[PDB]
């Protein structure tokens, strides 16, 4: 199961406001670390 974005924290992320993709561009970089992927989605 390659799950890089793991679904709490993408609702959390999501809870940001974000999208789904954005978890994953973001996570799929930092290699899903929520609080930094999140961090990082916030670029776009």
Same mark, same amino acid.
């Given at each position: 199961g390659s799950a890089t974005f793991p679904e709490q924290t993408? $609702?959390?992320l999501m809870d +940001?406001? #974000?999208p789904r993709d954005a978890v994953v561009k973001a996570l $799929?970089?930092?290699?899903?670390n %929520?609080? #930094? %992927? %999140?961090? +990082? +989605?916030?670029?776009?």
């Amino acid at each position: 199961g390659s799950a890089t974005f793991p679904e709490q924290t993408i $609702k959390q992320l999501m809870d +940001l406001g #974000f999208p789904r993709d954005a978890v994953v561009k973001a996570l $799929k970089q930092t290699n899903g670390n %929520a609080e #930094f %992927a %999140a961090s +990082l +989605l916030f670029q776009s």
